[PDB]
């Protein structure tokens, strides 16, 4: 299971959603509730802390994952407006990702075009949250063929 | 209704597939209109702003704020049309240096707002934090009387709009230097602040 | 055997080492009494102190398992609490850099930092002796693990070195190295006594408000 979230400059969130495997129908076992939205705010410090450097511990708009906490795999994104697409890695043993930097750096190019296409809406503005049902069919989708 | 401000829903991968509603190619079709309708809509912006306003400075900053409302916009669109959607793509550099977003507005922005590519780019001398943005032949506002300058803030409206979302807050004005053959000329000078400069002065 | 003598003779040296250390304590200023099992002298208990060190650091080398890296650790409290007021002790410094490198790998040169890499290798014989019986003393005879102490051995590394860096633009610590080594710290954590578990999660407080690491 992988919680993803957009969170916005002044430390707010405009997309979340937590999406699991189907086999675990409930996913992450009490961490759920309270670590999640903690350590994700936690990696957000680190995040801001890397936005600004040039050569990384190229091209500066995906970033590897991030750190490693209590055995959760937290990967990074930054768009061009300077919204985080931060996106944690769950599992009962130990996650490899870097392995899905073929895949899951699509993934995050296709969802900045979402989200592109959700900011040009004129009546949309910044910090506002993402209240559309279309979003969540074509983020999960994405979620679906980007596994 | 899916998200709110006050959960969040667990739903499992590999499921159904969902209808089909709405989508767009991002990418554009080349588009072209008269310059004669935008200057009518230029001029009812400011003829409803010089009627509901009583006095300049507060007129000057709603124009800056129509302005703002589309670079905030523009900066994501321009920057992902630059880097290339569902064909594969990759991602710009994302520059952070002061000295090459305005190199990406002097080539990129003003040849996307406008037909042609910005005319000069040179910094202050007298000063650090002082940056001259220059054309010859302002296009959106050459139907006024020229001793008047607060109809050419909504252009850098748009660039102040350009540059706090991109990371750099800033502030602008726009001056008329009547330099040469070009009897306006517009100026437009960028103020920074302290706490992005030494920034940029703690990465050496 | 010559392995009990040898291991008794290496506790005699780590209690000669921390008797040492201890004897000069409060810099002696005026303490000419009788000075029982003490020297209370300017610099004499801390020349007695290196000299334990010493001999400890070579019965711990040749007894080559916790206690070997507590007289690696304790030439370097010798060192700094002797720094604390005027040292000049190369020569102690050259008999540590001479066992470090006949047991371990030193490859450094550096002023103050050849303590950081004398802990973070004194971190590794614990680490190597873990796998061992758990239990070797009487006074944690019905403890859990040596982790209790072990969590000690990094705060008191990381309290002895986040203070190096003082706000600059020439920094000696980076701050992602010292991070990403408080990244690996969040072991099980979860049972232990609750006024350790305040003062430890105070001083990752610490560490985090003066590296500006705020959330």
Redesign the interface.
Known sequence: PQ?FAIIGKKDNP?????????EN???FPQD?KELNPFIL??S???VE?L????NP?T????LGKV????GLAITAY?????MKFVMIHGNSANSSVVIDDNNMR?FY??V??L???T??N?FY??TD?????????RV??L??KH? | TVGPKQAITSEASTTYIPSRIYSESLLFKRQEASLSAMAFLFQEMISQLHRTCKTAGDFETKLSDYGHNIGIRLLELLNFRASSSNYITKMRRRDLKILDILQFIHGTLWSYLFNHVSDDLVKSSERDNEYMIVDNFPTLTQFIPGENVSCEYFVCGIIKGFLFNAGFPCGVTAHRMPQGGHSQRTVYLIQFDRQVLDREGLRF | NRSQQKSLGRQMKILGNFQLLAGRYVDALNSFVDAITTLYKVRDYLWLGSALDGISICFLLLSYNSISIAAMQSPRNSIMSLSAPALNIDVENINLPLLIKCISDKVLYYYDLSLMHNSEYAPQVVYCEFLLKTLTFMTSCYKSSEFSKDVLDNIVKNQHRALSDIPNSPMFPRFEVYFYSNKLFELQLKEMQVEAQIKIYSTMAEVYRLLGYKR
């Open positions: 919680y405009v997309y979340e959603i937590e999406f699991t495997n189907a129908p409930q996913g759920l705010h936690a957000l410090d680190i802390d936005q600004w450097q040039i511990t091209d500066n708009c995906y750190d490693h906490f209590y930054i768009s061009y407006s300077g699509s190019q296709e900045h075009e989200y592109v296409k900011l040009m004129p503005k910044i949250p993402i209240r559309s049902p279309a979003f969540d069919s999960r989708t979620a679906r596994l």
